[PDB]
């Protein structure tokens, strides 16, 4: 009955829970419990057991030491319709009954802000569900099994962890982190792996384009060819810096073909205007084409080569999915098609210069903070 149904979040606060200035927090599935059957997922609402015999006594000690006991569980099956919320609620209370200590439980029912590794659930714990008492991150701890451990991190553990979301949730918040085996059983630290792209490296500063000695626009007409992955932030950059400066905007998600596109470039160049071709432009054929309009009109031609890697683009796309309900998702399939076809632009196709456009932070402090969070386990 201590349940709160919020948007894309469920919170249970057991009788006996008090706010505290430090937290011991756990994932649920694969950390505090596992299936009795051995299946990844429970055959029934009754298909669970406490993961290790040592857990209840550990939790009792933590509580005596003044730790608020908390669960951060990803349960996207509820948002996906696979698992009824009331069934889960019943399961959580029975678990808690068995664990024998007061817990507060936060449940990420959906994709996005609250789904580990993104720190939505921590921020809710802190801002909304700890009665205003500041939590010391350094004195707290997060324990979870989605820890990005390598295959054979232990005997029988022949496959790497399905996910790194638990470790990364801790990394996003700054929480000391352990796996269930390291924490409850005092096993040695297992080897693990983090995603290649680390959003904490994303900088807001830095030059806008390269070389820093050249100049973004020119006073005279010219054709600018944009190159970059889908979701790389091309269109946003172009509106901000070119269209607002007087360049004609040519775009292929809007038009619908490359004929529609080239004739706009020729047109606009007759109209004494400046054109920018805002599409992927993965390969030599695509770009030579717009290079030909430039040479037709006796105008220079440049390339804006967006440096965004595939993981930076994917990251950008998740950030937009999370913060903008109108943003159309840019699917991976579409990412791989570009990559499969990509070949770098070279001065030898006929560019006066190629500009490199670095990937940087696109804006409110809370959204910056969100942007440099790991967002995929
Ligand atoms: Mg887990």
From Swiss-Prot:
Its EC number is 3.1.3.32, 2.7.1.78. ATP binds at residues 228-235. GO terms for biological process: DNA damage response; double-strand break repair via nonhomologous end joining; protein K63-linked ubiquitination. It comes from the Eukaryota. GO terms for molecular function: ATP binding; ATP-dependent polydeoxyribonucleotide 5'-hydroxyl-kinase activity; polynucleotide 3'-phosphatase activity; ubiquitin-like ligase-substrate adaptor activity. Plays a key role in the repair of DNA damage, functioning as part of both the non-homologous end-joining (NHEJ) and base excision repair (BER) pathways. Through its two catalytic activities, PNK ensures that DNA termini are compatible with extension and ligation by either removing 3'-phosphates from, or by phosphorylating 5'-hydroxyl groups on, the ribose sugar of the DNA backbone. This is Bifunctional polynucleotide phosphatase/kinase. The lineage of its organism: Eukaryota, Metazoa, Chordata, Craniata, Vertebrata. The chain holds residues 144 to 522 of 522 of the full protein.
């Amino acid at each position: 009955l201590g349940w709160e149904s919020l948007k894309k979040l469920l919170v249970f606060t057991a009788s006996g829970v008090k706010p505290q200035g430090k937290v011991a927090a756990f994932a649920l599935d694969g950390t505090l419990i596992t299936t009795r059957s051995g299946k990844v997922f429970p055959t029934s609402p009754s298909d669970w057991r406490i993961l290790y015999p040592e857990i209840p006594k550990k939790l009792q000690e933590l509580a005596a030491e003044g730790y608020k006991l908390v669960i951060f569980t990803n349960q996207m099956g509820i948002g996906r319709g696979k698992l009824p919320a009331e069934v889960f609620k019943g399961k959580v209370e029975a678990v808690l009954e068995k664990l024998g200590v007061p817990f507060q439980v936060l449940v990420a029912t959906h994709a996005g802000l609250n789904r580990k590794p993104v720190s939505g659930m921590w921020d809710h714990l802190q801002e909304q569900a700890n009665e205003g008492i500041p939590i010391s991150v350094e004195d707290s701890v997060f324990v979870g099994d989605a820890a990005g451990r390598l295959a054979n991190w232990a005997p029988g553990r022949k496959k790497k962890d399905f996910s790194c979301a638990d470790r990364l949730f801790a990394l996003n918040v700054g929480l000391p982190f352990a796996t269930p085996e390291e924490f409850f059983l005092k096993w040695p630290a297992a080897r693990f792996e983090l995603p290649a792209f680390d959003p904490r490296t994303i900088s807001s500063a830095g030059p806008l384009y390269l070389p820093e000695s050249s100049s973004l626009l020119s006073p005279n007409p010219e054709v600018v060819v944009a190159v970059g992955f889908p979701g790389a932030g091309k269109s946003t950059f172009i509106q901000e810096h070119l269209v607002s400066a007087g360049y004609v905007h040519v775009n292929r998600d809007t038009l619908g073909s490359w004929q529609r596109c080239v004739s706009s470039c020729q047109a606009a160049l007759r109209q004494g205007k400046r054109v920018v071709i805002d599409n992927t432009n993965p390969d030599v054929p695509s770009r030579a084409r717009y290079i030909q309009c430039a040479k037709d009109a006796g105008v220079p031609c440049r390339c804006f080569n967006f440096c965004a890697t595939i993981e930076q683009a994917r990251h950008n796309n998740r950030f937009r999915e999370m913060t903008d309900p109108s943003h159309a998702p840019v699917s991976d399939m579409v990412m791989f098609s570009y990559r499969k076809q990509f070949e770098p632009p070279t001065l030898a196709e006929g560019f006066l210069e190629i500009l490199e456009i670095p990937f940087r932070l696109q804006l409110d402090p809370a959204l910056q903070r969100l942007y440099r969070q790991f967002s995929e386990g």
